[PDB]
Amino acid sequence: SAIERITKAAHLIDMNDIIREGNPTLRTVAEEVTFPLSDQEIILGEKMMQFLKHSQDPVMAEKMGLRGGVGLAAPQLDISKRIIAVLVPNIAYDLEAIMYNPKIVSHSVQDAALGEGEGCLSVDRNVPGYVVRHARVTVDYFDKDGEKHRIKLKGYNSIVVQHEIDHINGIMFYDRINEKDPFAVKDGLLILE
Ligand SMILES: CNC(=O)c1cccc(C)c1Nc1nc(N2CCN(c3ccccc3Cl)CC2)nc(N2CSC[C@H]2C(=O)NC)n1
Ligand code: NI
Numbered sequence: 001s002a003i004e005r006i007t008k009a010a011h012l013i014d015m016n017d018i019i020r021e022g023n024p025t026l027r028t029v030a031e032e033v034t035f036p037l038s039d040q041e042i043i044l045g046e047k048m049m050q051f052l053k054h055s056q057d058p059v060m061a062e063k064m065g066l067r068g069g070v071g072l073a074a075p076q077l078d079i080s081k082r083i084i085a086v087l088v089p090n091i092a093y094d095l096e097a098i099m100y101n102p103k104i105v106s107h108s109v110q111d112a113a114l115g116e117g118e119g120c121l122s123v124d125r126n127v128p129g130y131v132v133r134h135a136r137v138t139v140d141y142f143d144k145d146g147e148k149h150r151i152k153l154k155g156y157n158s159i160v161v162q163h164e165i166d167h168i169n170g171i172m173f174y175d176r177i178n179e180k181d182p183f184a185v186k187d188g189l190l191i192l193e
Pocket of ligand 1: 055056126
């Protein structure tokens with residue numbers, strides 16, 4: 001299986017582990033993990049975070065042929081589990097978390113979108129447009145020990161976590177771009193830039 005292969009001590013996650021558009025797994029709803037976690041489920045989260053750190057290291061990214069990322073969801077590794085990793089550097093980190101069974105439990109009426117649009121590791125093309133998301137979210141998740149965390153996010157952090165949670169729900173960023181008018185600005189939409 002993908003999880004068995006990826007969680008080998010010797011394995012570093014790279015672009016060859018990341019599935020692309022068209023793979024049914026990206027459109028499937030991922031399964032909740034149960035507690036206690038298996039060693040493999042813990043290792044997977046750790047490997048995913050290591051991938052993000054490698055992708056953000058210019059030297060390592062070059063050596064490994066990585067595209068830079070600030071989030072990764074297990075379904076992108078062909079693993080249909082509700083596990084995501086997020087690593088947003090402060091422009092060392094604005095947000096660093098491995099989240100098991102993450103869930104948005106509250107959100108703002110206000111919407112937000114990145115002014116520069118969104119990119120995705122499983123998408124090898126540019127898809128222009130404002131990706132409309134909630135401006136602010138409250139997120140519950142469990143850590144590797146099964147301890148519950150409840151955090152509040154705004155700005156970039158909020159965008160990134162919503163993007164990754166979408167993956168575990170079979171949703172892609174362009175699903176949230178206005179079809180007819182990709183750069184439309186509705187009342188109540190904050191453009192982040
Ligand atoms: C089409 N417009 C654009 O690509 C886009 C264009 C400009 C600005 C933004 C902000 C854009 N948007 C966007 N840029 C990113 N990267 C900026 C570069 N950075 C990065 C790159 C290299 C090394 C280290 C790092 Cl840190 C990695 C992250 N990432 C995402 N997504 C959206 S949510 C999850 C996140 C993700 O990780 N995607 C793979 N969106
Ligand atoms: Ni993505």
